[PDB]
Amino acid sequence: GNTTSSVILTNYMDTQYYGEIGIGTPPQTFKVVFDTGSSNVWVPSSKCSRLYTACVYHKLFDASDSSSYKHNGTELTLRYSTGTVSGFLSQDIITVGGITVTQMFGEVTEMPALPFMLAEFDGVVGMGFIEQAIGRVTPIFDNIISQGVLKEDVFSFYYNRDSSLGGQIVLGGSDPQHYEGNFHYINLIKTGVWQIQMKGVSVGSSTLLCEDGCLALVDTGASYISGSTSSIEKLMEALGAKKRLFDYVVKCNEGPTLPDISFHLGGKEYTLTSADYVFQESYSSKKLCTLAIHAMDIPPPTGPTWALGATFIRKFYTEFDRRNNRIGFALAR
Numbered sequence: 030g031n032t033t034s035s036v037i038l039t040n041y042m043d044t045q046y047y048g049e050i051g052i053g054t055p056p057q058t059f060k061v062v063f064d065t066g067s068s069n070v071w072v073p074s075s076k077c078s079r080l081y082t083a084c085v086y087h088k089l090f091d092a093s094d095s096s097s098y099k100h101n102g103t104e105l106t107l108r109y110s111t112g113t114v115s116g117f118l119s120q121d122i123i124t125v126g127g128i129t130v131t132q133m134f135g136e137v138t139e140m141p142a143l144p145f146m147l148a149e150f151d152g153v154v155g156m157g158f159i160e161q162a163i164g165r166v167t168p169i170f171d172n173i174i175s176q177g178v179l180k181e182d183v184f185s186f187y188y189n190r191d192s193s194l195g196g197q198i199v200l201g202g203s204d205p206q207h208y209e210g211n212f213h214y215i216n217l218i219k220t221g222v223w224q225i226q227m228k229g230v231s232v233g234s235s236t237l238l239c240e241d242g243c244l245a246l247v248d249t250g251a252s253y254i255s256g257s258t259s260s261i262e263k264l265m266e267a268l269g270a271k272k273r274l275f276d277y278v279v280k281c282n283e284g285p286t287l288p289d290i291s292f293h294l295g296g297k298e299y300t301l302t303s304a305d306y307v308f309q310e311s312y313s314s315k316k317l318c319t320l321a322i323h324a325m326d327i328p329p330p331t332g333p334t335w336a337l338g339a340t341f342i343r344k345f346y347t348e349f350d351r352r353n354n355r356i357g358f359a360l361a362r
């Protein structure tokens with residue numbers, strides 16, 4: 030059909046990128062992460078007991094103030110890699126930058142403080158495929174596409190390096206003010222998942238890893254690059270990084286020395302120098318700069334998989350293509 034719209038997103042410290050949807054008539058503004066790993070939409074419920082302190086610190090959806098809410102009620106539990114939330118389903122109209130769509134979503138009734146006491150976004154909007162939607166709630170993008178409004182059945186991510194605009198999603202296309210050189214499309218390995226095949230991680234000069242072909246979720250709703258705790262440990266052993274429990278660290282003076290590491294995603298040799306993966310908070314002899322790669326064991330479901338999160342999407346503009354079932358990366362301007 031023809032139209033494109035775009036969601037500007039705010040960037041919080043290169044670790045949280047969230048935009049804004051409005052649910053209801055009148056609209057109730059919510060901050061959300063637009064994440065390609067999940068496929069359901071949820072937001073905190075006014076009904077959340079505020080004995081969950083993530084609920085007494087976030088926007089809550091009040092359906093009694095919405096004229097257009099159509100009550101449904103089926104329980105829902107989203108078990109994400111990092112934490113879980115449960116609640117029930119509701120339906121109201123959600124507005125995703127310009128396009129308005131009736132949508133089934135979750136009003137979360139239970140929301141752990143860890144980690145959601147530290148999340149600057151209030152909800153999640155999944156850009157995944159229906160194969161992952163808990164409870165087969167038709168996901169907002171298959172809904173927008175039914176409007177017939179978009180030019181192209183695609184969406185693209187720009188995640189800025191921060192301090193200017195924080196990032197941008199374009200629904201319906203991709204915006205060449207933000208990428209240079211031209212695209213490199215890798216096809217999806219099955220439909221249902223923004224998943225692709227990866228065959229080789231190389232620390233410095235020589236393939237230490239995934240030499241026999243691994244997978245990679247390309248995950249916009251993840252701050253880091255991650256591999257399973259084995260693949261990560263040998264990468265980290267090699268770099269010389271230590272574990273301060275949730276992350277690996279390095280003595281900051283070494284940071285600007287750490288080898289370029291490269292991802293050989295189907296076709297090309299996508300490659301991050303040590304600016305790209307190290308948070309250079311300083312350049313001291315001793316103090317510790319965290320690295321932007323985490324171990325994360327994504328569960329059997331999809332797989333154990335490497336998740337290419339926001340450390341990678343900020344170096345290469347990601348176009349997610351549903352019409353031809355493939356992902357394409359090209360360089361960020």
Ligand SMILES: CCCCNC(=O)[C@H](C)CC(O)[C@@H](N)C[C@H](C)COC(=O)c1cn(Cc2ccccc2)c2ccccc12
Nearest residue numbers: 045046062066067068109110111144147148249250251252
């Ligand atoms: C549809 C459910 C079944 C699939 N579930 C999964 O396991 C997938 C892999 C989960 C997945 O996308 C995760 N990678 C992210 C998760 C949805 C997003 O929620 C999060 O836990 C968070 C994600 N962030 C950081 C973040 C925020 C915005 C953009 C990038 C990264 C948080 C910060 C503080 C607190 C919680 C989170």
